[PDB]
RNA sequence: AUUCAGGUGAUUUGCUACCUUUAAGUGCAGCUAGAA
């Protein structure tokens, strides 16, 4: 899995169909919204999930949760690093998506954080993919709500270029 | 941004483990010290 950004035009397009699709741009944002690198690939779709910074309510999400996967530094639990918001993952088109170029990125603190995140994500990549798969299954079955409408998004997204 | 998914224990509070590919109650705490 890897860090991506997604183009606004694409986000705005999907937002037409489901407003739960994550916000991509904001003046308050110090860096572009980052997503995680192919969390589910099924039925010919590729999903990315948005990362989000710590908020108070996160304290109540249990490891067993399908909506959220909490991030923290390997071996250092008190260093919370936000969470992957699986319930707002979205199918993507490769041309509307773009890997962060960490190699050319200046050595800021944010970069350091990205690397504490990556190491944790990588060590848990399977857990993450498995939660994504079960999340979407439950949503197809009508067993879970308050997530992006995966069927609807899956239905319109390849029409973006039109 | 979008403010805690449901469930597995003849009992089950917290966290955790487990199941959700239809199956699945483990572990640490807490509480208990009972009697065949
Ligand atoms: Co780490
Ligand atoms: Co750890
Ligand atoms: Co639950
Ligand atoms: Co099932
Ligand atoms: Co059924
Ligand atoms: Co178990």
DSSP A78-143: EEEEEEE-GGG-EE--GGGEEE--GGGS---HHHHHHHHHHHHHHHTHHHHHHHHHHHHHHHHTT-
User: Cβ distance A41 to A47 under 8 Å?
Assistant: yes
| A55 and A38 Cβ atoms separated by less than 8 Å | no
Nearest ligand to the C-alpha atom of residue A64? 3
Ligand nearest to the CA of A68: 3
| Residues in Cβ contact with A130 at an 8 Å cutoff, skipping those fewer than 6 apart | none
CA of A146 to the centre of ligand 5 (A): 21
Please state, in angstroms and rounded to a whole number, the distance separating the CA atoms of residues A149 and A59.
26
Protein A34 CA to nucleic acid B27 C1', in Å? Answer: 36
Paired with A50 in beta bridges are: A35
Distance between the alpha carbon (CA) of A83 and the C1' atom of B30, Å: 30
Q: Could you identify the residue whose CA is nearest to the C1' atom of nucleotide B1? A: A23
Query: Helix A109-123 crosses helix A125-140 at what angle (to 10 degrees)?
Result: 70
Measured CA to CA, the distance from residue A8 to residue A100 in angstroms comes to 15
Q: Is A29 helix (H, G, I), strand (E, B) or coil?
A: coil
| Element housing A15 (H / E) | helix A8-17
Q: Can you give the resolution of this entry in Å?
A: 2.5
Q: Is the dihedral of CA A143, A62, A5, A38 positive or negative?
A: negative
CA–C1' distance A161–B19 (Å)?
41
Which positions on strand B lie below 7 Å from a protein C-beta? Answer: 1-7, 15-21
Domains in chain A, ordered, with CATH? 1-162 (3.10.129.130)
**How far, in Å, CA of A136 to CA of A121, rounded?**
20
Output DSSP code: residue A14. Answer: H
């Amino acid at each position: 899995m890897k860090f991506y950004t997604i183009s606004s035009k694409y986000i705005e397009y999907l937002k037409e169909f489901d407003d739960k699709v994550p916000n991509s741009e904001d003046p308050t944002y110090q860096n572009p919204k980052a997503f995680i690198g192919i969390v589910l690939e099924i039925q010919g779709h590729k999903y990315l999930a948005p990362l989000t910074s710590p908020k108070k309510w996160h304290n109540n999400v249990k490891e067993s949760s399908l909506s959220c996967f909490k991030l923290h530094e390997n071996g250092v639990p008190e260093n919370q690093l936000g969470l992957i918001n699986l319930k707002f993952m979205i199918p993507i088109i490769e041309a509307e998506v773009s890997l962060l170029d960490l190699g050319n990125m200046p050595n800021t603190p944010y970069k350091r954080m990205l690397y504490k995140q990556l190491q944790f994500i990588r060590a848990n990549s399977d857990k993450i993919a498995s939660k994504s798969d079960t999340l979407r299954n439950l949503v197809l079955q009508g067993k879970m709500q308050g997530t992006c409408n995966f069927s609807l998004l899956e239905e319109k997204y390849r029409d973006f270029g039109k």
